[PDB]
Amino acid sequence: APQSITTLPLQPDGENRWRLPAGEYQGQFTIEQPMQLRCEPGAVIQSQGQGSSLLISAPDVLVEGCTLYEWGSDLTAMDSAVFILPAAERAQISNNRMRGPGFGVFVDGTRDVQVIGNEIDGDAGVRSQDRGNGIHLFAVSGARVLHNHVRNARDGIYIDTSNGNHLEGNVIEDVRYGVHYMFANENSLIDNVTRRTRTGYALMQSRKLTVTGNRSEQDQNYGILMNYITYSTITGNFVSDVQRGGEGKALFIYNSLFNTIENNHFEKSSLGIHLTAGSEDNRISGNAFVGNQQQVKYVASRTQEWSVDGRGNYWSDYLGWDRNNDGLGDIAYEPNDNVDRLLWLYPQVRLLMNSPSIEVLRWVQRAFPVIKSPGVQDSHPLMKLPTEKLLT
Amino acid sequence: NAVEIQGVSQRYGSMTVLHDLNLNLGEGEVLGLFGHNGAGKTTSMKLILGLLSPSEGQVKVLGRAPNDPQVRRQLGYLPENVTFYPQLSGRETLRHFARLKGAALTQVDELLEQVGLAHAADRRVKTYSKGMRQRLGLAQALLGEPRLLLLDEPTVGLDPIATQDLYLLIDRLRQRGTSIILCSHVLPGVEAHINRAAILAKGCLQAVGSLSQLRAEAGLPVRIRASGISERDSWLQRWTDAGHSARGLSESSIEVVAVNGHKLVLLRQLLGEGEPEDIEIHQPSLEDLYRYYMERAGDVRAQEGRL
């Protein structure tokens, strides 16, 4: 494992600032001194396929404009492209191109690391179980990962036990998970774009975090998966066309107790929102459930009001009126019948689902409200689209 | 004088379906009304019952107005076809009409035995034949001593023992002083029981009077046939001396169409020479008299087999 000083860097400025010229290199490299090294666009630092290509151990290093290629793939020894030690505090990794079968940016124990503007194309042939993470973050406080471009890695931007950090404006394409969260208390992520992913947003056991403005374009089987998230905030997310591959759920809420789910847009999926029985009584108001073949799946008999402060959600199949000209509807909207939960409770009713007796039983509930099980209704639903800005 | 129709010319739709019939009916007579082309048969039927208003003329039933309630308790109307109330029983149907007409309820048990229906009393009218409903329809017509029956074909769907017994019940009520009107289209058989016929056609009442008068006011041949004559060759000619064509169709079936002006000398021909077996003075019946008065007003004789 050689060092960065073993190359030929031409200094532009004598304040530990270096500039590597155009031309390829070979092998792993190590930064041990606080060097704000830049690179020409022809600086293809291509390792031979083993080891972490650019290991970083010194604080305050502004690595910029490098192009790394073909590092190792041993995920147990964490063969990354940019390994950042716990002593390498406040590192800037700006505008880099990476192509190799392991971790793109592996940091651990770091503070105030900035991973900005990189393009990390992961793999093509590995089975998405050994491709390595795009931007792996392991218990970092202060990080700023902004406007990257991760493609074809394994589980995108993995985050493990990292407390305070922002994920702003990065595009994540053709991965298993878009953004993975594990025990990340008081986190934040803004305006990320996830495309063609087997789960758009994994929210596992991370409390008190802000999920805002994110987009999920044509993901597979899970739009935003939230497991055990408490005191969170889901405001302004655009989840569109979650096709099957699960049957396709734009939001799957599993054991999330308290969180504010407002102003979202769940569009053209098979299930608009799946609410499990353990995750109840959280503020869900102002979303747009348009184009989904089934809006809410709620297999319970407990009532669940879905409108805080008298304002509810926009539903596309809401066949209601508005006499006094406010934004709210006049009749309440129950998204589920009693026969719409017999199909979920007993799957053999799928053979009887086109029968006239089921079409009779849908009308008997609208005429005789004693047989209506208490569902997932919202008093005062919206009449117009509240997310007029999220379609752009 | 039960039914006194005078000057009545019923118009509806400016069609004038009845015109100037003056039909006075006596207090013991049995009148018969027979209608073909003319609608008079039904309009006049209504007119006496009071459920129609006589335009340009007055109808006086039983000396009073035809729609008064005091005379409408004294009428009896057997309509054409009355399937009454199929879920009610026989007694409960007749007790219903006894309560409406004001008759005493003790008459119901002695009218379901007077008419032959006590075996089918307390049985539902849906389990009745057409003859049993005509028996029940008569039972409400005799309800509470009616002084004017008005029967519209009472013997349809009825077995011939009850038909003969119905006219014996009519002949009991004629002697009691109750005028009966037998409006029928079953003209053979009713001519033995009525007193005066009234053939009305195209609205205008063509002929009225007794059966002896309708043969006098209409020259019709009397059909004397003497079945079982001794000699037949001179009996082809011996009646034609005074203009009676002795036409025969069998070994001895000489149906001699006479003229009703030489009835002494043909029977002196019959009884002076030749022995009879069963003489049959066959008068021109009510079927034959009806087609004379009908043809005299508007009707033309139909062809060889063409009705």
């Binding site: 179980q129 589980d155 596992m204 998966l225 497991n227 408490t230 054991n255 029985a277 409770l345 | -």
Partner: protein, 144 residues
């Protein structure tokens, strides 16, 4: 009679709920044999969160968890895999499970009583597990 066989875990075995790789985690891993298709779980608390849903109360399926009285806690073998209804789960320990609260499953109740006093937890049966307890125990583990 196809529900009688607890199948072994593979490396390419995703959880039924969270969907991530099961054998990259410590702790006992529950699974549910359905006799029409086997679905597996990354933690025992994620299996018990799935079991208490009303789609699966009526579902005739055998539940199988690991026996942590006869296994090392970081890498449990497929091996001995007891029935989950007759187990003795400890709760509230500081051990790091995969998804939910740490519910180490045992079969002999004394080794379950060993880990309860060794970490400050309380042994409890399968029927005492409810969704008021799973959300309470995970908040005491991954909170504050």
């Amino acid at each position: 009679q196809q529900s009688l066989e607890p199948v072994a875990f593979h490396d390419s075995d995703e959880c039924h709920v969270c969907g991530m790789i099961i054998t990259d985690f410590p702790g006992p891993k529950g699974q549910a044999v359905e006799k029409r298709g086997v679905k597996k779980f990354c933690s025992t608390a994620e299996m018990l969160g799935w079991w208490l849903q009303p789609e699966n109360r009526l579902l005739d399926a055998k539940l199988y968890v690991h026996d942590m009285g006869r296994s090392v806690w970081e890498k449990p073998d497929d091996g001995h895999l007891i029935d989950a209804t007759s187990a003795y789960y400890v709760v509230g320990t500081s051990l790091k499970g995969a998804m939910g609260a740490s519910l180490a499953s045992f079969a002999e109740e004394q080794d379950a009583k060993a880990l309860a006093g060794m970490h400050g937890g309380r042994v409890l049966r399968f029927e005492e597990i409810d969704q008021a307890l799973l959300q309470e125990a995970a908040s005491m583990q991954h909170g504050g």
